[PDB]
């Protein structure tokens, strides 16, 4: 296999505005097919990238900054990855739309799956409204990320390389003196399988496919043979013996990571999807499902000269392989200090979500299930409703709801809601067989409150097998048409995604 830790970790450049004033910031981003070397020992790989880069440029904004991005498609008219034509029924083959994950965004700038567009906006989807997306950024400082969200193509377009980081800076958090600038580094983790000739491999079908299956055929899961960080296979990063802030983003299709340091050292988590935690949390390891973000501090002060592996213990379609997928990246504490470490690791970070005392307008019971198609494939469904079925999740603007998510399947699903960040209330185990046979919910244990990592704000949440997960969300400030879905992209595309109408009565 490819030799680990021979390439330096790239740090995506920060995107510069095309136009900027006090009143408005204007960006242009063009999707392009490009080649990049993903590892020292590989030929260059054909990829799809925002501004021709993989990952895309990091976008940095202030809270309340009036930001516009014209996302443009200048991609080839044919895909290089295998499209399954049977999962969705004169349309172009290549459709794209950019979703700012975690964005508090007006609905027509949110990247609705059916607001897609082909090259130069020549053809557009039925929900398309506008070329230039509007991000008012009227929300907490947080790690966001942007990726393709096109109907029935999300798993392919994202795997092709259409991902990037988007950071909201709240000037009020500057007094905390968290590590910043060069010492504040996004880590976008993507697992990939790469052929000897350097080309990306994505399966055309399940292994030993049933003759009943079409070709190509969507697969229920994808597990890459290699791990990349910031577009490089198993890279190393030279760090100062100093505190660093890392914005950890799982940008993988299916794979969940469970991260630790091979020297037994700790992380300090300061933030989740929705921004700073109320209190910092000392951690030895953490689980990171697709689309989850961890804002963490690693203190290298006492580890000068050392090589430390960011390790992974979570398997994907089997046990983790010590020589491959058990490795993420390597820190080398060999960079001379550029200046005094004046950064801090404060305990008191932000207001508790529990300070809020909103009235519960509605309690929604939702089940994770599905059916089988004419080809024998599993079709994963939220409430046994297809994407095209009439909308059922219709919260009222400005109201708070508790969503109770029932998972009677054998796997964890990272459930994601657009627009909002939410509070985690609790998880509680139930009798699966009883539920499957009768629909009766019979608990096999008491409710478990969230760990300290989930006491802040979340937008993507692990719904474990055989449990009921309860979350609470205030739906707003905008009304309109959004979505909610599992962020395992192979599930999202077929067909574990539903519309979500926030109404203004
Ligand atoms: Cu997302
Ligand atoms: Cu999202
Ligand atoms: Cu799923
Ligand atoms: Cu989404």
Curated annotation (Swiss-Prot):
Q: Which residues form the Plastocyanin-like domain?
A: 44-80, 95-172, 234-312, 372-503
User: Which co-factor is required?
Assistant: Cu(2+)
Mutagenesis or variant effect for residue 474 to F: Retains approximately 30% of the wild-type activity with SGZ but does not affect activity with ABTS
State how changing residue 110 to E affects the protein, per the record. Answer: 10-fold decrease in catalytic efficiency with ABTS as substrate. 91-fold decrease in catalytic efficiency with 2,6-DMP as substrate
The UniProt disruption phenotype note reads:
Disruption of the gene does not prevent spore formation, but mutant is blocked in the appearance of the brown pigment characteristic of colonies of wild-type sporulating cells.
Superkingdom, according to UniProt? Bacteria
Q: Which Enzyme Commission number(s) are on file for it?
A: 1.10.3.2, 1.3.3.5
Which coarse location class describes where this protein primarily resides? other
Q: What is the effect of changing residue 425 to F?
A: Retains approximately 50% of the wild-type activity with both ABTS and SGZ
**What does the UniProt record report as the effect of altering residue 474 to A in this chain?**
Retains approximately 60% of the wild-type activity with both ABTS and SGZ
* An MF annotation (GO) of this entry: copper ion binding
Q: How does activity depend on temperature?
A: Highly thermostable. Optimum temperature is 45 degrees Celsius for SGZ oxidation. Optimum temperature is 75 degrees Celsius with ABTS as substrate.
Naming one, the record's GO cellular component terms include: outer membrane-bounded periplasmic space
* Protein known as: Laccase
Q: Which organism is it from?
A: Bacillus subtilis (strain 168)
Organism classification, top ranks? Bacteria, Bacillati, Bacillota, Bacilli, Bacillales
Q: Which gene encodes it?
A: cotA
């Amino acid at each position: 296999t490819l030799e680990k830790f021979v390439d330096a970790l790239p740090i995506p450049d920060t995107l510069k505005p095309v136009q900027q004033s006090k009143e408005k910031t204007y960006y242009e981003v063009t999707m392009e097919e490009c080649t990049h070397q993903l590892h020292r020992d590989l030929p260059p790989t054909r990829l799809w990238g925002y501004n021709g880069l993989f990952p895309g440029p990091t976008i940095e904004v202030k809270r309340n900054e009036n930001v516009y991005v014209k996302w443009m498609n200048n991609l080839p008219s044919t895909h290089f990855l295998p499209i399954d034509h049977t999962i969705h029924h004169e349309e172009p083959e290549v459709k794209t739309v950019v979703h700012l994950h975690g964005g508090v965004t007006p609905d027509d700038s949110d990247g609705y799956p059916e607001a897609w567009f082909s090259k130069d906006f020549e053809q557009t989807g039925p929900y398309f409204k506008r070329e230039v997306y509007h991000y008012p950024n009227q929300q907490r400082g947080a790690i966001l990320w942007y990726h393709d969200h096109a109907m029935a193509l999300t798993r392919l377009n994202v795997y092709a390389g259409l991902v990037g980081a988007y950071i909201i800076h709240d000037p009020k958090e500057k007094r905390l003196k968290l590590p910043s600038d060069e010492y504040d580094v996004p880590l976008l983790i993507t697992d990939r399988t790469i052929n000897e000739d350097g080309s990306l491999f994505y399966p055309s079908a399940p292994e030993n496919p049933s003759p009943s299956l079409p070709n190509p055929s969507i697969v229920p899961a994808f597990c890459g043979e290699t791990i990349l960080v910031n577009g490089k296979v198993w890279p190393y990063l030279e760090v100062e013996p100093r505190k660093y802030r890392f914005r950890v983003i799982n940008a993988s299709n299916t794979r969940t990571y469970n991260l630790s340091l091979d020297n037994g050292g700790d992380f300090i988590q300061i933030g989740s999807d929705g921004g700073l935690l109320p209190r910092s949390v000392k951690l030895n390891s953490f689980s990171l499902a697709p689309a989850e973000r961890y804002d963490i501090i690693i203190d290298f002060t006492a580890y000068e000269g050392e090589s430390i592996i960011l390790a992974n213990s979570a398997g994907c379609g089997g046990d983790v392989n010590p020589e491959t997928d058990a490795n993420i990246m390597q820190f080398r504490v060999t960079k001379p200090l550029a200046q005094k470490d004046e950064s801090r690791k404060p305990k008191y970070l932000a207001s508790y979500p529990s300070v809020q005392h909103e009235r519960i307008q509605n309690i929604r019971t939702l089940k994770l299930a599905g059916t089988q198609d004419e080809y024998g494939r599993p079709v994963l469904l939220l409430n046994n409703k297809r994407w095209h079925d009439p909308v059922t999740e219709t919260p009222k603007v400005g109201t708070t709801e508790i969503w109770s998510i029932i998972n009677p399947t054998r796997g964890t699903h990272p459930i994601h809601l657009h627009l909002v960040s939410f509070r985690v209330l609790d998880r509680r185990p139930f009798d699966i067989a009883r539920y499957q046979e009768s629909g009766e919910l019979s608990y096999t244990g008491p409710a478990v409150p969230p760990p300290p990592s989930e006491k802040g704000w979340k937008d993507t949440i692990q719904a474990h097998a055989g449990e009921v997960l309860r979350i609470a969300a205030t739906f707003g400030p905008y009304s309109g048409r959004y979505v909610w879905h599992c962020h395992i992209l192979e599930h999202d595309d077929y067909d574990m995604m539903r519309p979500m109408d926030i109404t203004d009565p």
